[PDB]
Design a protein around this ligand. Structure first.
Ligand code: YJG
Lengths: 318, 294, 297, 318
């Protein structure tokens, strides 16, 4: 909807950072002596209503270089807005494309590509799939922005959240499915039991014949108090270009950047823990030609069941 | 005159001395409005700098007619019938009147033999008759049961016209009578009287078929949008459709010429009075295409 | 007070128009989301690849203005129950397109017509949309064929219940959905009385009044007949919104006068008793019966 | 499973008919004077465990011509059986391929293609989709077997079946979904209310740029008795090659051909009918890039609801 896009566009920290990263990349790619000959081809993939496009134009001006923009968006209602803003302002610099990244036949090759396909747990909106389906019309000395992203997990206790999950039951489905699916939530009344540790990591472009976006990780968290375990919270950090970064990690959070909230993974039964013990947890990232999903389980100090086999409760549709 | 022209071109009509009348509307983007244009040199169209006169309308243009020599009648999105006249030296265009009498879009307009009255039809199902000197409605007739698509006046009688609708009827009118209308597969879309004969006419259908009134022929793939007769002593018939093609037929409904010049809907055709071999067409792709016909 | 709106089919500039509308005292406006004479091709070339933009943008108004002040309308050339397969397929595609743009804008309701007996495929398309805003179905009291004049010699003029059967079959196909409601059009002559009672029980959200049923007073103001007044009184209870359609035939009098007549009618009504007053806020609210033997109050 | 294939392979009528059709096609394609020069390329698409392959070899012998066989099967467990039978018997004549029709890059072009992708309602196992995805490595003077198929529908009454449907309710879903999905069933205690009429039809190859396998049909059935309506039964007829045909239609059933049973489409509420009235019914065949399904509704004498919108209860996965 249009309201969603409106809320997205209201955080200026992220767009200032994107602008700076583009500026830096272009200064480093085009020497100060061919300013008026070398035109760089940029691509915004997932252009929405076009704040990245404007940030890019601003940045090229700032740097005082020359670019050439392609915009790709698969939603037609947003394409309407884009074509209007193009006819009225952007002009010939900008070419609009209504298509999916993974099906578009590009005219030429790009120098830089730019995307905003990041959710609360980094990869849970399917950036790897899409950018991998797009990397062929990027050239050899090509750059992706972002180039790197990483997710994080930490344990928590909270009766309030467990009872709010209890309440998400609904008719015509498994009466335990609400425990097998994640949630985005501004955490408030809760206790964190141990620091966050890294889970999965992706980097673009991927220059490997064996492209496998499937993953398996194991983690061990030390405990220093008696308590209960109710779930795991998630975060992420990204590297846009070298020193330009974004984080929602509570230790390194970016100031005034309120676009994203945390993500919560729950478990069915609470687990009692004692001081000195150690929680271990396994996560999987799984796939087929149609869907992506996650599975998680606790091994120590006591074992749990495997949550969400075969995506029976949560799937991310391709 | 306006700076830019609207991208959708709907009407094109030659007058006696050879000048060309154009009609445009905007159908997408910020502002939905209209404009009219006169080109003495028709091969210089559609360039707004080489025009002879032009004007901007409040709303969209659906149809228009020459009223003899100076006058222009316009059917409008507003639900109004509009009369404009040219300035003495053909340097400007000015409004004579603007009457809001229809309760929805005016789809079609036609002038009558005498040159003093006219008939209008709308999507509100009402047909009216106007006296162009007094600026009044003489009559409103509600006979059809749905939207009116085309009305056509007879070139030989000042009381006879035709009317078609989306209810699947074709009526013949004579206002001299107390019950004016009389009746005569797929839905009808377009009409045209035979110039010479006074009892014959052609009509096009939703599916793609033309018919003489019987005689029939399948000419296009989509909806027939218009039918125009050549000014020959024995006339040819031009047919234009929604499949983006044009065709010229002989007196037997046999095909003689076909064109795929346009990249969008063809909207109107007009034969030049100087050279009876030439035909012009317009469309929503912003092209004015000139055809030389065998 | 009572709520009313304006129905239009020509909107050259949206902001100026909405301003004037609100000025005369109207609360909402109903208008097309696409241009009504702009037919789209989806299947066949070369028109399939017509360049955009296909419509005007969302950034012309504000989110709350969209959300509160605009009712949508479907374009007239769209006919999903045609007998020509091509037209029917194009109509399906265009209908979904317009409905989804409406959703994208966050509109509170959307107007759709019933002007014939067979609307099976229309109901199918909408039912698909729903299982993926309210929808106001435009249905008249009298059919337009039973409404024309006797001026055709070889096709003479002459059944009060067919237009209700249209709606009933439609809603049955859609499975008595909550998001589907009636928009009743009214005309000059009125049906019987058991009929008007029949439209009792139906989910009527709006009534459509044309300018052509208002008579003119000796002073030159607009007024109505007494049977029309009775019907208006009955509708005011259900608490419907009224829509004015058509042209100002009394060019001397702005639309504000129609609305003031309506307010005058509303004010002079037999006020609510003590029951009707106490019975405010409970209309059609289901309650469980009390059990003062098994339970304690 | 292997048992399923075993049951399939037990009806000899169908395979005799296939053999005859192949024989005839080859006699008509290759003159009696180039018997020893013109080798015809055949393809079995959906070869299973290979009874069609053997029927084809038998037929070529019968005709005394020369062929060259490719077999395509996307199930690996059946490919095991095929490769064994190949190594032991078939030999070099036969080349086995483990792939999907719609993804295989063929070496050369074929003269004839042969398929068994027919269910009880003809098209409900997705033969059009597959054969359309396969028609490009068929040449211009190419032949498909089957070339034509047609489905049929008729109304019925039966309390027993309605109550057996009533019983197919199960937890964790809509309590009316069992009425929105079809069934294969040997009909016995039931009453048929009117003859069967044709529904949808397909023909291969499809030489049209506008390939649309979506369909809409309307049908009117006269009644001559008072009764109830409980559902619609389905059948089909196919043309293999010219005069060789197969049918499960009760008026034209093929003798001793017991591979297929009828298919039943139900409705939620029974409808009362009277003598002289007329049942009307609408069916749709719908699609997306992922799924195919059907929708049906009764209009006369009384209206029903639309059954199975958006495939919410029954889908055929691509
Ligand atoms: C716009 C807005 N309001 N007015 C005043 C107006 O509406 N006056 C009006 C309306 C209707 C009637 C029937 C009359 S009357 O004088 O014929 N009868 C009095 C009924 C009445 C109605 C409203 C208030 C009080 N009394 C007068 C305008 O003129 C415009 Cl342009």
């Amino acid at each position: 909807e249009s309201q969603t896009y409106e809320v997205f566009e209201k955080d200026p920290i992220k767009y200032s950072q994107y602008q700076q990263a583009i500026y830096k990349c272009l200064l480093d790619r085009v020497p100060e002596e061919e300013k008026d000959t070398n035109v760089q081809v940029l691509m915004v993939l997932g252009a929405g209503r076009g704040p990245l496009v404007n940030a890019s134009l601003r940045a090229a001006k700032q740097a005082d270089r020359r670019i050439k923009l392609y915009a790709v968006e698969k939603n037609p209602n947003a394409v309407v807005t884009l074509e209007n803003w193009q006819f009225e302002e952007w002009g010939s610099q900008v070419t609009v494309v209504s298509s999916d990244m993974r099906e578009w036949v590009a005219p030429e090759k790009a120098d830089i590509i730019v995307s905003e396909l990041l959710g609360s747990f980094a990869d849970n909106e399917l950036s790897p799939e899409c950018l991998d389906g797009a990397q062929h019309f990027l050239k050899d000395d090509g750059v992706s922005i972002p180039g790197e992203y990483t997710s994080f997990l930490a344990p928590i206790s909270s009766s309030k959240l467990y009872n709010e999950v209890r309440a998400c039951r609904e008719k015509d489905r498994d009466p335990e499915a609400q425990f097998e699916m994640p949630y985005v939530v501004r955490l408030h009344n809760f206790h964190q039991l141990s620091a966050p540790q890294p889970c999965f990591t992706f980097s673009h472009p991927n220059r490997d014949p064996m492209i496998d976006n499937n993953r398996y990780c194991t983690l061990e968290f030390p405990v220093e108090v008696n308590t209960v375990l109710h779930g795991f919270a998630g975060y992420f950090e990204t590297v846009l270009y070298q020193d330009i970064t974004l984080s929602i990690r509570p230790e390194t959070h970016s100031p005034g950047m309120f676009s994203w909230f945390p993500i919560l993974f729950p478990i069915k039964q609470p687990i009692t823990v004692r001081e000195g013990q150690t929680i271990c947890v396994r996560f999987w990232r799984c796939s087929n030609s149609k869907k992506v999903w996650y599975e998680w389980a606790v091994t120590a100090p006591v074992c749990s069941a495997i949550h969400n086999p075969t995506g029976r409760s949560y799937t991310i549709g391709l | 005159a306006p700076a830019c022209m609207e991208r959708q071109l709907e009407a094109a009509r030659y007058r006696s001395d050879g000048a060309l009348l154009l009609g445009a509307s905007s159908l997408s983007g910020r502002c939905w409005a209209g404009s009219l244009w006169l080109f003495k040199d028709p091969c210089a169209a559609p360039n707004e700098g080489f025009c002879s006169a032009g004007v901007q309308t409040e709303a969209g243009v659906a149809d228009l007619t020459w009223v003899g020599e100076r006058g222009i009648l316009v059917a409008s999105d507003s639900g109004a019938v509009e009369l404009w006249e040219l300035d003495e030296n053909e340097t400007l265009i000015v409004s004579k009147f603007c009457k809001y009498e229809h309760d929805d879009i005016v789809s079609t307009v036609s002038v009558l033999s005498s040159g003093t009255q006219a008939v209008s039809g709308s999507k509100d199902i009402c047909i009216k008759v106007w006296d162009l000197a007094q600026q009044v409605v003489l009559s409103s007739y509600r006979a059809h049961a749905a939207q009116v698509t085309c009305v056509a006046a007879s070139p030989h009688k000042d009381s006879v016209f035709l009317s078609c609708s989306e209810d699947n009827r074709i009526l013949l009118w004579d206002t001299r009578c107390p019950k004016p209308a009389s009746q005569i597969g797929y839905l009808p879309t377009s009409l045209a009287w035979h110039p010479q004969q006074s009892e014959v006419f052609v009509f096009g259908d939703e599916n793609g078929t033309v018919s003489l009134v019987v005689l029939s022929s399948a000419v296009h793939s989509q909806c027939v949008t218009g039918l125009v007769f050549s000014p020959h002593s024995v006339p040819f018939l031009a047919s234009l459709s929604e499949d983006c093609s044009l065709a010229v037929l002989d007196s037997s409904l046999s095909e003689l010429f076909r064109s795929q010049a346009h990249r969008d809907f063809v909207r109107d055709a007009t034969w030049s009075p100087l050279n009876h071999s030439l035909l012009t067409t317009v469309g929503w792709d912003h092209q004015v295409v000139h055809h030389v016909v065998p | 007070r009572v709520s009313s709106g304006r129905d239009l089919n020509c909107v050259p500039e949206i902001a100026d128009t909405l301003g004037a509308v609100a000025k005369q005292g109207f609360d909402f406006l109903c208008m097309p989301v696409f241009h009504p004479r702009f037919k789209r091709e989806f299947i066949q070339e070369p028109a399939k690849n017509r360049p955009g933009p296909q419509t005007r943008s969302d950034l012309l108004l504000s989110g709350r203005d969209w959300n509160t002040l605009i009712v949508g309308k479907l374009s007239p050339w769209i006919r999903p129950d045609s007998k020509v397969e091509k037209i029917r397929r194009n109509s399906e595609a265009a209908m979904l397109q317009e409905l989804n743009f409406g959703a994208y804008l966050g509109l509170p309701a959307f107007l759709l017509p019933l002007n014939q007996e067979d609307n099976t495929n229309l109901a199918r398309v909408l039912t698909n949309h729903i299982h993926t805003s309210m929808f106001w179905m435009r249905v008249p009291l009298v059919a337009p064929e039973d409404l024309r004049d006797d001026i055709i010699e070889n096709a003479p003029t002459t059944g009060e219940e067919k237009t209700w059967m249209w709606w009933h079959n439609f809603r049955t196909l859609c499975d008595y959905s909550k998001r589907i409601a009636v928009a009743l059009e009214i005309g000059a002559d009125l049906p019987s009385n058991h009929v008007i009672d029949r439209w009792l029980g139906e989910p009527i959200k709006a009534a459509i009044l044309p300018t052509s049923i208002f008579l003119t007073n000796k002073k030159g103001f607009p007024v109505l007949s007494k049977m029309h007044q009775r019907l208006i009184f009955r509708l005011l209870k259900l608490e419907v919104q009224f829509i004015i359609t058509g042209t100002n035939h009394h060019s001397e009098k702005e639309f504000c006068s129609y609305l003031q007549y309506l307010e005058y009618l509303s004010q002079n009504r037999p006020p609510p008793n003590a029951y009707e007053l106490f019975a405010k806020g409970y209309e059609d609210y289901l309650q469980s019966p009390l059990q003062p033997l098994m339970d304690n109050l």
